Design a binder for this molecule. Structure first.
Ligand SMILES: *[C@@H]1O[C@H](CO)[C@@H](O)[C@H](O)[C@H]1NC(C)=O
Ligand SMILES: *[C@@H]1O[C@H](CO)[C@@H](O)[C@H](O)[C@H]1NC(C)=O
Length: 123
């Protein structure tokens, strides 16, 4: 079975709870494996709407990854030919579930917009 030590985290500072998880090996994750990858880390496979919320907080990636309900997405703020072919927004493809990509994962415990930037403590 998939093990967590086979995974690497490509978004070290989660935005609105969202990270991106890839396989260290060349072969990446099909849709079912993407869900398992997030769960091995205690996360859920992100929904496209959760990725959209992160984009509004300036979450941007340059990797295609699975989200819930069988879409592959990339999160783009700036047009880039090499990152989603100059698209902008959360770009969405409905792709056969056997295809292998990264996984967008969601962490509901995050209380900061950027998990690496503290926010003022309210007492
Ligand atoms: C996804 O990969 C797993 C390997 O862990 C395999 O058992 C499963 O059949 C694959 N799903 C598809 C739709 O290819
Ligand atoms: C999820 O978020 C909580 C709160 O920020 C944090 O303690 C935990 O380490 C996070 N887990 C993962 C796998 O990102």
């Amino acid at each position: 079975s998939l093990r967590a030590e086979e995974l690497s985290i490509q978004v070290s500072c989660r935005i609105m709870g969202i990270t991106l998880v890839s396989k260290k090996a060349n072969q990446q994750l099909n849709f079912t494996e993407a869900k398992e990858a997030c769960r091995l880390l205690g996360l859920s496979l992100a929904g496209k709407d959760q990725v959209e919320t992160a984009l509004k907080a300036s979450f941007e990636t340059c990797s295609y990854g699975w989200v819930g309900d069988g879409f592959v997405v990339i999160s783009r703020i700036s047009p880039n030919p090499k990152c989603g072919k100059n698209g902008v927004g959360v770009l969405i493809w409905k792709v056969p579930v056997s295809r292998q990509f990264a996984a967008y994962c969601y962490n509901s415990s995050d209380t900061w917009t950027n998990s690496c930037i503290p926010e003022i403590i309210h007492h």
